[PDB]
Amino acid sequence: VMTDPIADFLTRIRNANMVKHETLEVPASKIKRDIAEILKREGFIRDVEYIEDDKQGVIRVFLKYGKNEERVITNLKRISKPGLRAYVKADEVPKVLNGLGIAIISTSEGVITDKEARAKNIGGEVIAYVW
Amino acid sequence: SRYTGPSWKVSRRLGISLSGTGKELARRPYKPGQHGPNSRGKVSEYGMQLTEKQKLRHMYGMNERQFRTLFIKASKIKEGKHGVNFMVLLEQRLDNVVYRLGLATTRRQARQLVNHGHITVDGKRVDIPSYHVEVGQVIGVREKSQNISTIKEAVEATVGRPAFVSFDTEKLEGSFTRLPERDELYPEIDEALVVEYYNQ
Amino acid sequence: YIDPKHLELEDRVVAINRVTKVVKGGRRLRFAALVVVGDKNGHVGFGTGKAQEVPEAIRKAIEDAKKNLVEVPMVGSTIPHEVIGVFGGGRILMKPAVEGSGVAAGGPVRAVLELAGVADITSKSLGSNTPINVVRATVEGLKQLKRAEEVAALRGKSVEEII
Amino acid sequence: AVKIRLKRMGSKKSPFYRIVVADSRSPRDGRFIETVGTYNPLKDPAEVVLKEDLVLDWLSKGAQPSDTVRNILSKEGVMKKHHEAKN
Amino acid sequence: RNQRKVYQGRVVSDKMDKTITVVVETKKNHPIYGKRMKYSKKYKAHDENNTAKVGDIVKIMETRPLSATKRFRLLEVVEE
Amino acid sequence: PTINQLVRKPRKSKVEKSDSPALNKGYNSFKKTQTNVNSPQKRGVCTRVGTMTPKKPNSALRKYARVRLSNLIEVTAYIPGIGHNLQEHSVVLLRGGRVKDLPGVRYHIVRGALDTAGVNDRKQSRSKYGTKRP
RNA sequence: GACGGUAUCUAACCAGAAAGCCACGGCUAACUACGUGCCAGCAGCCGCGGUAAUACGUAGGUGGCAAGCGUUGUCCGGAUUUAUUGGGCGUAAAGCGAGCGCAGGCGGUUUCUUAAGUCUGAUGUGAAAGCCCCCGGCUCAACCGGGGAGGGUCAUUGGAAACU
RNA sequence: CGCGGUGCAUUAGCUAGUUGGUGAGGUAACGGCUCACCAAGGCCACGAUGCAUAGCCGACCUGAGAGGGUGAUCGGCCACAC
Numbered sequence A: 001v002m003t004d005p006i007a008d009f010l011t012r013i014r015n016a017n018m019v020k021h022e023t024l025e026v027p028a029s030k031i032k033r034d035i036a037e038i039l040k041r042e043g044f045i046r047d048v049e050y051i052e053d054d055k056q057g058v059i060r061v062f063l064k065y066g067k068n069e070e071r072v073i074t075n076l077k078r079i080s081k082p083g084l085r086a087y088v089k090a091d092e093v094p095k096v097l098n099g100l101g102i103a104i105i106s107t108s109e110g111v112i113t114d115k116e117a118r119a120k121n122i123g124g125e126v127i128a129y130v131w
Numbered sequence B: 001s002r003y004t005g006p007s008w009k010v011s012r013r014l015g016i017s018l019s020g021t022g023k024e025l026a027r028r029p030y031k032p033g034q035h036g037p038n039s040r041g042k043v044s045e046y047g048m049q050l051t052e053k054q055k056l057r058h059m060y061g062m063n064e065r066q067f068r069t070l071f072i073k074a075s076k077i078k079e080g081k082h083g084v085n086f087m088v089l090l091e092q093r094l095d096n097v098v099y100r101l102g103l104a105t106t107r108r109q110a111r112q113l114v115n116h117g118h119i120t121v122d123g124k125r126v127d128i129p130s131y132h133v134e135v136g137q138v139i140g141v142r143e144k145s146q147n148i149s150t151i152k153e154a155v156e157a158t159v160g161r162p163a164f165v166s167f168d169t170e171k172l173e174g175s176f177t178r179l180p181e182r183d184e185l186y187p188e189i190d191e192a193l194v195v196e197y198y199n200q
Numbered sequence C: 001y002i003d004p005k006h007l008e009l010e011d012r013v014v015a016i017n018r019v020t021k022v023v024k025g026g027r028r029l030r031f032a033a034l035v036v037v038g039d040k041n042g043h044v045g046f047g048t049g050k051a052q053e054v055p056e057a058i059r060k061a062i063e064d065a066k067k068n069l070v071e072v073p074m075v076g077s078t079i080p081h082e083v084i085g086v087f088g089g090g091r092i093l094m095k096p097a098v099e100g101s102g103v104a105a106g107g108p109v110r111a112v113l114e115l116a117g118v119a120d121i122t123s124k125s126l127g128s129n130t131p132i133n134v135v136r137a138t139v140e141g142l143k144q145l146k147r148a149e150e151v152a153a154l155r156g157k158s159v160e161e162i163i
Numbered sequence D: 001a002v003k004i005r006l007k008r009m010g011s012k013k014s015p016f017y018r019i020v021v022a023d024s025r026s027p028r029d030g031r032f033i034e035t036v037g038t039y040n041p042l043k044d045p046a047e048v049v050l051k052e053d054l055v056l057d058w059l060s061k062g063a064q065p066s067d068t069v070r071n072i073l074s075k076e077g078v079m080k081k082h083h084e085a086k087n
Numbered sequence E: 001r002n003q004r005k006v007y008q009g010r011v012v013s014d015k016m017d018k019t020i021t022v023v024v025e026t027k028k029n030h031p032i033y034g035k036r037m038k039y040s041k042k043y044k045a046h047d048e049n050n051t052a053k054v055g056d057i058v059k060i061m062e063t064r065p066l067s068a069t070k071r072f073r074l075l076e077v078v079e080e
Numbered sequence F: 001p002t003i004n005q006l007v008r009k010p011r012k013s014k015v016e017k018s019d020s021p022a023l024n025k026g027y028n029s030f031k032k033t034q035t036n037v038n039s040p041q042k043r044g045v046c047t048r049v050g051t052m053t054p055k056k057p058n059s060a061l062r063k064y065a066r067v068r069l070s071n072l073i074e075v076t077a078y079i080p081g082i083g084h085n086l087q088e089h090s091v092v093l094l095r096g097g098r099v100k101d102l103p104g105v106r107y108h109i110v111r112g113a114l115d116t117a118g119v120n121d122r123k124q125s126r127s128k129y130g131t132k133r134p
Numbered sequence G: 001g002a003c004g005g006u007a008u009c010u011a012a013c014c015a016g017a018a019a020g021c022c023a024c025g026g027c028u029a030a031c032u033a034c035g036u037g038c039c040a041g042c043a044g045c046c047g048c049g050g051u052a053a054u055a056c057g058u059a060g061g062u063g064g065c066a067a068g069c070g071u072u073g074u075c076c077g078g079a080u081u082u083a084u085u086g087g088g089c090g091u092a093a094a095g096c097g098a099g100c101g102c103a104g105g106c107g108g109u110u111u112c113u114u115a116a117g118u119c120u121g122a123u124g125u126g127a128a129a130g131c132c133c134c135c136g137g138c139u140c141a142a143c144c145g146g147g148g149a150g151g152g153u154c155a156u157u158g159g160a161a162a163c164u
Numbered sequence H: 001c002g003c004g005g006u007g008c009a010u011u012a013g014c015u016a017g018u019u020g021g022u023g024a025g026g027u028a029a030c031g032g033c034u035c036a037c038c039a040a041g042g043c044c045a046c047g048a049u050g051c052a053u054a055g056c057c058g059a060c061c062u063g064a065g066a067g068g069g070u071g072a073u074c075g076g077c078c079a080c081a082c
């Protein structure tokens, strides 16, 4: 049985990105939408749209490949897992590739990137790394 | 302990002129010993790094323990290149200050002057050749010692005082105006290899 | 592709391996030389050369390395960011190092970095010590390195926006 | 009883002292309650640093300065302040 | 005035008159791996009238020693 | 392993053993037991002296002495240098160090200490072999 | 004023009384001569010695360090060689012969609420000495003194509500 | 009193003032602390019990760090004086 839909979301993106598929689809969840919109506004993924169905809805992601079909998203990594949770204090927020990548974090202020979290000087749960 | 053996053999082993005159390397510029003149195998990277470390510490006539501790201090300095700062500390060493001011022909001679106490820092006696001299401190010769042939010969012979130093012959009073610059320091030495050597 | 010409390249012999082929009569000894040739400014490559004599093996490897030159990003005296290169048993982790720290690495990785023109970096060999594999793994990691400008361009944001 | 006394510090032949409040039973350089000042006899005019407020508070509470600490508090006028406050 | 530690817990033994055995049911992070681990602590709390029964959620406040093992006093019976 | 598996059974490291065990244990005459005290060397009495054949690759007559130590353990120790004054019932000092040639020798007999006379005519590495500077 | 005529200072005389230790086959900076002849012996590992040994002994040179030098012993490191950071289990060590299942571990989407976890602020405390950062004193340093910081899966208390 | 810091499961049951209550006595003081009566309870795979080892800590050595090792000198606490 699936135990981490967030990790499944990240892996769906990774596999689709590896084969350079144009789009991908996932069952819709609040945290999945938060991650998708973070990537959207960070420019990693070209576009995002949401569909509503009778199960839980769906979220469709259009991938972004640079000129010469270069992959924008180098890779994705799940940090906090159901087996082991990862919580970081304000001063512990990490930098992915010395800032070139991003870290998606969940906080009492919402789901934010590492830059935003350290700007607000709050910690949280490190959901993922992206670069 | 202080090194007192031949200087030419050490300098030609290092492959660079310690005195800077090149006198040692002029004739028979091989490493000492019977195997010097003939062909010798290639030097490993470890040999190169050790050779650079030996170059610095033989230039300044320091024992390995004191050399290593001073290297650690240079690391403690927060800003700038570690090796450059290490060479800067080596310069600020009291003996080198006397040598740069030109009151001695050689660093060994300057060290003996300091050890015998003929030098005074800001008018106070100092017998510690390792003494750390800061920028702006005035190094002067002991009054009883100002009229001796050796330092007189050294001062007249000396003609080039580095840019960072400023000296006054009549008072026999010198001082570093500022910290030496990398290029002003010995260029033949690559502080990077010394840094890597001690990184081990 | 990188053109060998217009670049004042310099080479270093990482290792010279005495490889043997057994023939009916007996052994047929040869020398396989692994060489890394670089520019000291961001270009470097490695080549192999197998020949009956050491000078000929070295020459062959140099030609191969020149043909295989590649460009390494370098911010200041170090690399943009941390990286790990994996090839076979080779596995090398390379992190940016503060100015003046030097090149902390071992043997074959040292040659690659010195010839590539990196003056300050930290690294560790987490895999095998086979020279050819570590050299291959090192170049894999360097190729993985990315430029802030390129990342900025791909993501459609300015370098300041990324950082 | 509570004492205000000199805890010896420094090095051999180079004594230094901390004026500390400690229970009399404690070891000289061992347990103490609070540090209230310093004392360097090696300077020709002996150097003293003092927390007059803390010293006055402890004197009111019932601390008994040793002889040298009393001399220090007199030279600093603290003993006079405590005397007046009692009055 | 100061306050004494008060804990919520579940009764697991009431066969002793004028007393009950509660469970605190806290979690702790493993020192090496950091995962939260179910950790159960049980206290002997003095019951005034045996009001609490087995499997009842109650609050207990630490008190002066009452018996060989009693250090707590029942306050609330929040669930049955 | 999963983190839960590690929690249930944490990692356990291998335990090393001294290559010179006899030096690690003292002896208590009163309690008549072996104490666990590490010692850089140990005194002993040579119960026998002789020579031994190296393993197959080498061929020589390595000089050895069978020694009972101050902790009552009997071991075999090598005699470095050329020529020795050691004989049975001679008091010697033993330091750690194996002998690759010999099968069952793990300790060396310090030269120039106790009955172990220095190596006659030794002139290089005199510290080892315990001969005074001539 | 025990230390004690001690530190310290001045003046006179003299290069005169004051350098050893290990190593040089590779790892590892350091090489040649004899003597020896699988012997004597060396060795931390690889391995050296069978009559032309840079590997043994000596000599001469050379490298390292220095009032020290080398050996032994012990802990850490290298060791990702118990891998939380940071490993694996087709053939190199490693998937139980298979299933059913208590406890335990984990767990689909969502509304509201709670605030144990989680994040955060304030307060108290985590002595002094010691590491670390500044600033002074000893002719320098060691050392000494002063001011800070650090150090908690801490206690009380106020917040935040994404995730558990 | 909460919480933290050794190994062994080829150590799995331990406990009878033991567990609680009612009194009484006793203590600077609460308390099975002691005693009488009443009950049968109490601890334990979240490792009781047993065995082995060990004074604990501020600190010290190492490590890039996480960690590993140590517990001299100095300070605190504890325990002992054939």
Ligand SMILES: CN[C@@H]1[C@H](O)[C@H](NC)[C@H]2O[C@@]3(O)C(=O)C[C@@H](C)O[C@H]3O[C@@H]2[C@H]1O
Pocket (backbone or CB within 6 Å): C023, C024, C025
């Ligand atoms: C009998 N003819 C054989 C035959 O030609 C072998 N090759 C097929 C050939 O092989 C050699 O050249 C080898 O290399 C081996 C050597 C033992 O004999 C050589 O002479 C070998 C010839 O003697």
Ligand SMILES: [K+]
Pocket (backbone or CB within 6 Å): G025, G055
């Ligand atoms: K050797």
Ligand SMILES: [K+]
Pocket (backbone or CB within 6 Å): G083, G086
């Ligand atoms: K792991």
Ligand SMILES: [K+]
Pocket (backbone or CB within 6 Å): none
């Ligand atoms: K199977």
Ligand SMILES: [K+]
Pocket (backbone or CB within 6 Å): G115
């Ligand atoms: K909460």
Ligand SMILES: [K+]
Pocket (backbone or CB within 6 Å): none
């Ligand atoms: K009772």
Ligand SMILES: [K+]
Pocket (backbone or CB within 6 Å): H055
């Ligand atoms: K003890």
Ligand SMILES: [K+]
Pocket (backbone or CB within 6 Å): none
């Ligand atoms: K006793």
Ligand SMILES: [Mg+2]
Pocket (backbone or CB within 6 Å): B001
């Ligand atoms: Mg010394």
Ligand SMILES: [Mg+2]
Pocket (backbone or CB within 6 Å): none
């Ligand atoms: Mg090829």
Ligand SMILES: [Mg+2]
Pocket (backbone or CB within 6 Å): D041, D042, D043, D044, D045, D046
């Ligand atoms: Mg005075």
Ligand SMILES: [Mg+2]
Pocket (backbone or CB within 6 Å): G028, G029
């Ligand atoms: Mg060499």
Ligand SMILES: [Mg+2]
Pocket (backbone or CB within 6 Å): F125
């Ligand atoms: Mg030898």
Ligand SMILES: [Mg+2]
Pocket (backbone or CB within 6 Å): none
């Ligand atoms: Mg030899």
Ligand SMILES: [Mg+2]
Pocket (backbone or CB within 6 Å): G079
């Ligand atoms: Mg390790």
Ligand SMILES: [Mg+2]
Pocket (backbone or CB within 6 Å): none
């Ligand atoms: Mg097999």
